[PDB]
Amino acid sequence: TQELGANFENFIGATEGFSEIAYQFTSHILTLGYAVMLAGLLYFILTIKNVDKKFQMSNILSAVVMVSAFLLLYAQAQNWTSSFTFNEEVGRYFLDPSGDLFNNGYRYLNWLIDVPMLLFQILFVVSLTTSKFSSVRNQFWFSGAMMIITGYIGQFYEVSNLTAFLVWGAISSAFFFHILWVMKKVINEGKEGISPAGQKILSNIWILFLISWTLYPGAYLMPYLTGVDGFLYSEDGVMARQLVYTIADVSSKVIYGVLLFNLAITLSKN
Ligand SMILES: CCCCCCCC/C=C\CCCCCCCC(=O)OC[C@H](O)CO
Ligand SMILES: CCCCCCCC/C=C\CCCCCCCC(=O)OC[C@H](O)CO
Numbered sequence: 001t002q003e004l005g006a007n008f009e010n011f012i013g014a015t016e017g018f019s020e021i022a023y024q025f026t027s028h029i030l031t032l033g034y035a036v037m038l039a040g041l042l043y044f045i046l047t048i049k050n051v052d053k054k055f056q057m058s059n060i061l062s063a064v065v066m067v068s069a070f071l072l073l074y075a076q077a078q079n080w081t082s083s084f085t086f087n088e089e090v091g092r093y094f095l096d097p098s099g100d101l102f103n104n105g106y107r108y109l110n111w112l113i114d115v116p117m118l119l120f121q122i123l124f125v126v127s128l129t130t131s132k133f134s135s136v137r138n139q140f141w142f143s144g145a146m147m148i149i150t151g152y153i154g155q156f157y158e159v160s161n162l163t164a165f166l167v168w169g170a171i172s173s174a175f176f177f178h179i180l181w182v183m184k185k186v187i188n189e190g191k192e193g194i195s196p197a198g199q200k201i202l203s204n205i206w207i208l209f210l211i212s213w214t215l216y217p218g219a220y221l222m223p224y225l226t227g228v229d230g231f232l233y234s235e236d237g238v239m240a241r242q243l244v245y246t247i248a249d250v251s252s253k254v255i256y257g258v259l260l261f262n263l264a265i266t267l268s269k270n
C-alpha cells in the first residue's frame with residue numbers, strides 16, 4: 001500500500017515517477033498560467049476608465065479574480081516543483097518525502113473564491129428583464145459554492161475510492177448543470193434591449209462560458225477517461241489534466257473578462 005502517494009499526481013509521482021518531459025512541461029504550463037493572470041491583472045486595471053461608470057464593477061471583479069488567480073496559481077506552480085525531485089539512478093522525477101507533497105488545495109481555493117465573482121460580474125454589464133438581480137446572484141453563489149465544495153470532497157477519494165470520487169463528482173455536476181441553466185437565462189435576458197453588436201458578443205460569451213467551464217469536470221475525470229489500464233492513467237493524464245485546467249483558467253477568467261469588457265464598451269457610448 002502506497003503511503004506517501006492523497007491525489008493522482010502524488011500517486012503517479014510515488015510509483016512510476018515523471019519523465020523529464022512530463023515534469024518540465026507541467027512546470028512550464030503552470031508558470032504560463034500565473035504569468036497570464038499577472039498580465040491580465042494589469043490589463044483590467046489599466047483599461048477600467050474606458051467603460052462607463054455603471055459597468056466598472058465588472059472590470060473590478062476581473063482585477064480581483066486576476067489577483068487571486070495569480071497568487072494561488074503561483075503557489076500551485078511552486079508546489080509542483082517543490083513536490084517532485086530528480087533521481088539520477090532511475091532518470092525520472094519522484095515524490096519527494098522531504099517536500100510537502102502535491103496539493104490541489106491551492107486550485108480548489110482559487111475556484112471557491114473566483115467562481116462566485118465570475119458569475120456575479122456579468123450582472124453588472126447586462127440588464128435582466130423578468131428575473132431579479134438578488135435571486136440570480138443567490139442562485140449563482142449557492143450553486144457555485146456547493147459545486148466546488150462537493151468537488152473538493154470528491155477529489156480526496158480520487159485514488160482510494162473511485163466510487164466516492166464519481167458520486168461526489170456527479171453531485172457536483174448537478175450544481176454545475178443548474179449554474180449553466182441560470183447563466184443561459186441571464187444571457188438570454190441580457191440580449192433583450194441591446195444592440196445586435198452587443199447580442200453577438202453575448203452569444204460568444206455563452207459559448208466561451210459553456211466550453212471553458214465544462215473543461216473543469218473534463219480535467220477532473222481525465223486520468224480515468226481511458227479506464228484504469230488506459231494511456232491517461234499515467235503521467236500523461238497528469239500532463240493533460242494540468243494543461244486543460246490552465247486552458248480553462250485562462251479562458252474562464254481572462255478571455256471571459258475581455259469579452260465582458262468589450263460588451264461594456266459596445267453598450268458604453270455606441
Ligand atoms: C465530473 C463528474 C461526472 C461523473 C459522473 C459519473 C456517474 C456517477 C454516478 C454513479 C457512479 C457509479 C459508481 C461506479 C464506480 C465503480 C467503482 C470501480 O469500478 O472501481 C473500484 C473502486 O476503486 C472502489 O470503489
Ligand atoms: C499563447 C499564450 C497564452 C495567451 C492566451 C491569450 C490570453 C487572452 C488574451 C486575449 C483574448 C482574445 C479576446 C479578443 C476578443 C475581442 C473582443 C471582441 O469581441 O470584439 C470587440 C467588439 O466587437 C467591439 O467592442
Ligand SMILES: *C/C=C(C)/C=C/C=C(C)/C=C/C1=C(C)CCCC1(C)C
Pocket residue numbers: 110111114115118147148150151152169170172173176213214216217220249252253
Ligand atoms: C476560474 C475557475 C473556475 C471558473 C472554475 C470552475 C470550476 C468548475 C466549473 C468545476 C466543476 C466540477 C465539476 C462540475 C465536477 C467535478 C468537480 C469540479 C469542481 C471540477
Ligand code: NA
Pocket residue numbers: 080081082083084085086
Ligand atoms: Na523539483
